[PDB]
């Protein structure tokens, strides 16, 4: 189990890079809303950022964490430099997707998907 690292020697160093990324995203949301003229609030933007970090909270491999951070920085740079358009920033909120209830009976009525 001797593997070449990416950036972090262990989870302690990786969680430091995670916190650094979270700060960068957290500071950036106010500019993103302003620059892209989004009709959402800074609170919704930061709640969405928080929701994106939370879904990955269960990782324990430092290499996987490093790659998630690398992608997070790539995503942040795309946003800061306005390489993304408003459509890309808003794809995180899936505003046109209809609710898909997640209880057995609701799925049973609509189709065969488990």
């Amino acid at each position: 189990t001797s593997v070449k690292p990416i950036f972090s020697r262990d989870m302690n160093e990786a969680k430091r890079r995670v916190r650094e990324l979270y700060r960068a995203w957290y500071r950036e949301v106010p500019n993103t809303v302003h620059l892209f003229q989004l009709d959402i609030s800074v609170k919704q933007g930061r709640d969405k950022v928080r929701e994106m970090f939370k879904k990955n909270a269960h990782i324990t491999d430092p290499r996987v964490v490093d790659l998630l951070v690398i992608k997070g920085k790539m995503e942040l740079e795309e946003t800061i430099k306005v390489w993304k358009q408003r459509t890309h920033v808003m794809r995180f909120f899936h505003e046109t997707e209809a609710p898909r209830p997640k209880d057995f009976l609701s799925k049973f009525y609509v189709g065969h998907d488990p």
Partner: protein
């Protein structure tokens, strides 16, 4: 010890004596070309496509027929070999018709493919071709005999596997023709297999004709439910539709054959289907409704009845997942009247011991038996592939076969002792001469058909047969590992039901007529509204409208075996699972989900939301039901025999007569085959 060393292209390989050159090449992963050779048929050696050079031998040898000699070097890729293949392919194609665009074999044709890999890329034949008249051999196999390459596979299969000496060759020379000479129909329960083994488009499936091409089909490996053998099959589909059924090789079950009902009844899946939930309107007629409305009317009744006022009957094609879901739902209203249509005597051990209702010798074990006693069964139509296995042992191991019952044609000669059930007592008591045969046998097999157990004296017959098997093992001569007692089932859902503790037969429902009845795919007509109180609330879950649906108050459309991943246990006790080939039609739903959904509406939610979880529940009731493809031994035949003596019951005077006596009774046995238009053609063919 006696293995000899041979070389394939210089690579040494050790092979048993008697191994052919073709089999030696197989060991190094080289497949010699062939057309007439089939590993399950007798060696023919007439196509000559297998000709292969032996180093230092000036003559190429037929690899399929030539035994290897020590030190032989087989040159599978020499110019001498390659030129032999090119010459034979050139002769094969000289008179073959330019039919590929209109021929159903196109795209999965051994002649096409081997011409590509081993033949030349052009023709030098400047003559006119032979043309042959086609011959009508029934509604299942279309013959375009100008495509025939005279390989004789069909003749050998019909003679050896199917036990029908109807096909042959007439004439001689270039005019030699395969056929029946006279106008005859090849209507055997295994006839459709000759479509598979014919290498060319000479023999093709009539129902399948022109509908698809091989490259565009999706193959779903699944299990057959048309009987209790559990033959492995491939469900071919395209663009959301089932196109045909193919065999799937399983050495220990169906080898590479399927019965004709398995092969051609799938067209019943496109007819009489239940596609929407139905309820009775205010005029008393069934009308389409939503799932919400239909389940609520069922849940309301379920919430108002308890104990013996609620019963269920499972039909023949029901999967284990639905069976356990239905049992759990009814148990939660304190009901235990979970019944099957197929009877099994409950006297003594009943269903307590698996060995009491299993084919304990297993299908592959038939090949090791030296005597077989068939009691009150017609395996030819009840389990065609099992009967094919018996004929295989009759042919190759000189198996002795005797039958107590009606003198049906089994495709192999057997000793017919009679049809009186009293003969079972004589054999046991030693009076009968066949008693000496059973004593002198090292590996005797006693097979009792589940059909015989449908008589009113089934318990007495099972007690009588178990007595014979008991005495055989007490007397010794048979080793302890060998199993002598067997039950041959004919229903796909029977063994799973008995493994789960369902009550076999509807006797319980007859003693205490319920107020609410669940008909889980139950179309045998074993319980009608004459047997129930005038106000009975009957719910029918199933996939076909046949017998159960028209008498129902609520119809819940379920999935057919091709439309769900579901568990079935064959007559050996071997659990296997189907795979979804297509989804259920319309508003139909997976069967176990319907029961799980109903349990929630009735505030009795079963504790499993996924297919994986309901299979965990199966493991908690019978741990063998999740051991897929494994045959789990069952023991304690001694205890079962001990309990089968406690109560004596009379044997009736009625002779043992199977439900199916001729082929016409074979085609329509379940709801799917009864809705098959192809099966109706077969019945018409064999009765007019």
């Amino acid at each position: 010890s006696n293995l000899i060393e041979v070389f394939v292209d210089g690579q040494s390989v050790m092979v048993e004596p008697g191994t052919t050159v073709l089999q030696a090449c197989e060991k190094v992963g080289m497949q010699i070309p062939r057309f007439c050779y089939h590993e399950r048929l007798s060696v023919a050696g007439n196509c000559r496509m297998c000709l292969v050079e032996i180093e230092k031998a000036p003559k190429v040898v037929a690899a399929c027929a030539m035994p290897v000699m020590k030190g032989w070097n087989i040159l599978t890729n020499s110019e001498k070999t390659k030129k032999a293949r090119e010459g034979v392919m050139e002769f094969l194609l000289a008179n073959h018709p330019l039919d590929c665009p209109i021929c159903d074999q196109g795209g999965e044709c051994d002649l096409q493919d081997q011409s590509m890999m081993f033949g030349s890329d052009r023709s030098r034949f400047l003559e006119g071709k032979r043309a042959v008249e086609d011959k009508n051999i029934g509604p299942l196999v279309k013959t375009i005999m100008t495509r025939c390459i005279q390989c004789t596979r069909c003749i050998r299969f019909a003679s050896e596997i199917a036990g029908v000496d109807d096909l042959g060759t007439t004439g001689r020379g270039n005019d030699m023709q395969v056929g029946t000479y006279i106008e005859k129909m090849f209507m055997s329960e295994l006839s459709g297999n000759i479509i598979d083994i014919c290498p060319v488009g000479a023999l093709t499936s009539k129902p399948y004709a022109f509908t698809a091409r091989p490259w565009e089909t999706r193959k779903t490996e699944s299990i057959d439910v048309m009987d209790a053998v559990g033959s492995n099959i491939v469900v071919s589909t395209r663009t959301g539709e089932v196109m045909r059924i193919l065999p799937r090789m399983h050495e220990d079950i169906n080898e590479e054959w399927i019965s004709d009902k398995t092969r051609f009844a799938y067209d019943g899946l496109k007819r009489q289907r239940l596609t929407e939930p139905m309820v009775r309107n205010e005029k008393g007629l069934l009308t389409h409704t939503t799932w919400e409305d239909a389940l609520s009317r069922v849940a309301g009744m379920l919430q108002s009845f308890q104990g013996n006022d609620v019963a269920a009957i499972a039909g023949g094609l029901v999967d284990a997942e639905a069976l356990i879901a239905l049992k759990d739902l009814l148990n939660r209203v304190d009901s235990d009247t979970l019944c099957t249509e197929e009877v099994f005597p409950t006297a003594g051990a009943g269903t307590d011991l698996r060995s009491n209702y299993l084919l304990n010798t297993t299908i592959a074990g038939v090949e090791e038996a030296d005597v077989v006693l068939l009691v009150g069964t017609n395996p030819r139509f009840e389990a065609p592939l099992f009967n094919a296995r018996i004929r295989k042992s009759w042919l190759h191991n000189d198996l002795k076969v005797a039958l107590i019952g009606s003198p049906v044609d089994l495709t192999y000669r057997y000793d017919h002792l009679g049809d009186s059930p009293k003969i079972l007592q004589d054999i046991a008591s030693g009076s009968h001469p066949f008693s000496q045969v059973l004593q002198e046998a090292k590996k005797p097999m006693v097979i009792l058909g589940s059909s015989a157990l449908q008589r009113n004296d089934g318990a007495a017959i099972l007690a009588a047969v178990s007595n014979i098997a008991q005495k055989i093992r007490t007397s010794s001569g048979v080793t302890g590992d060998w199993k002598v007692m067997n039950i041959l089932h004919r229903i796909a859902s029977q063994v799973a039901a008995l493994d789960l503790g369902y009550k076999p037969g509807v006797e319980a429902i007859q003693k205490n007529p319920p107020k609410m009845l669940f008909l889980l795919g139950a179309d045998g007509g074993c319980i009608t509204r004459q047997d129930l109180p005038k106000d009975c609330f009957i719910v029918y879950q199933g996939h076909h409208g046949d017998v159960g649906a028209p008498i129902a108050d609520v119809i819940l459309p379920g999935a057919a075996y091709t439309e769900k991943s579901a568990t079935y246990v064959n007559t050996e006790g071997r659990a296997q699972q189907t795979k979804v080939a297509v989804t259920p039609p319309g508003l139909a739903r997976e069967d176990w989900k319907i029961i799980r959904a109903l349990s929630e509406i009735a505030g009795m939610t079963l504790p499993y939301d996924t297919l994986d979880q309901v299979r965990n529940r199966l493991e908690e009731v019978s741990p063998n039901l999740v051991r897929y493809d494994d045959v789990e031994g069952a023991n304690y035949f001694q205890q079962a025999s001990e309990l089968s003596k406690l109560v004596n019951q009379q044997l009736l005077a009625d002779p043992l007569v199977p439900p199916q006596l001729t082929i016409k009774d074979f085609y329509m046995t379940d709801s799917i085959s009864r809705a098959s238009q192809t099966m109706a053609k077969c019945v018409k063919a064999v009765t007019e």
